[PDB]
């Protein structure tokens with residue numbers, strides 16, 4: 001195994017948990033994988049697929065992102081800091097996508113899922129763009145239970161990195177849609193301690209975090225260094241104890257190890 005894989009394996013061993021990494025370097029389209037074909041609970045990193053699926057819908061329904069969506073008291077689930085500010089009012093699908101992506105808003109994700117016809121509508125878009133691995137099975141908040149061995153609401157690092165590349169750097173989405181997703185990811189507020197923390201601060205990053213049961217702590221990112229082609233990096237992490245604490249430091253250190261090599 002490679003030098004970078006030995007360092008990631010050592011980071012994993014020091015952490016007590018299970019680490020999954022996929023890097024795509026688009027300069028030479030080379031890859032670094034660590035447990036790259038293992039399934040991991042996506043938690044909120046699945047919100048990228050849901051937001052992109054609604055963006056795909058907007059390529060035919062041109063005004064879709066401006067459509068108001070009612071926020072009812074019954075719709076509110078925990079960890080919905082934006083949607084809770086609009087109960088008994090409305091948010092547009094663009095505002096709900098930005099809330100889901102940039103504040104990890106769970107109610108906002110549920111509105112995206114409903115716009116897509118349920119969790120099967122999110123999986124549907126994954127399959128449409130060639131991702132045979134992603135599966136969304138539940139709504140918020142239960143999709144983050146992150147139970148060991150449970151295949152629901154999982155993907156592999158290899159699949160998610162390839163999908164994130166297609167959605168942002170590729171053209172799985174239309175031109176305005178692709179640029180909109182990139183802007184949303186670049187404006188994420190929840191990732192300062194995760195992949196971003198392990199990379200040189202001159203680099204531009206768009207990312208989406210996730211967290212859940214079993215101390216599951218995730219981040220998926222597109223990375224624009226100055227002077228070289230972009231990178232796609234997925235870092236998934238999960239732990240043996242159901243009540244384990246989040247470990248965003250592991251994602252930061254994984255990104256740092258990757259950036260070194």
Ligand SMILES: C=C1CS[C@H]([C@H](NC(=O)/C(=N/OC)c2csc(N)n2)C(=O)O)N=C1C(=O)O
Pocket residue numbers: 043044045078079103104105106141144145190208209210211212213215246
């Ligand atoms: C900032 C947050 C927290 S709310 C969101 C969501 N996670 C949960 O609601 C969750 N469910 O637990 C069963 C959770 C959050 S913290 C913990 N120990 N568990 C998600 O991942 O979509 N995501 C992020 C994030 O890190 O991006």
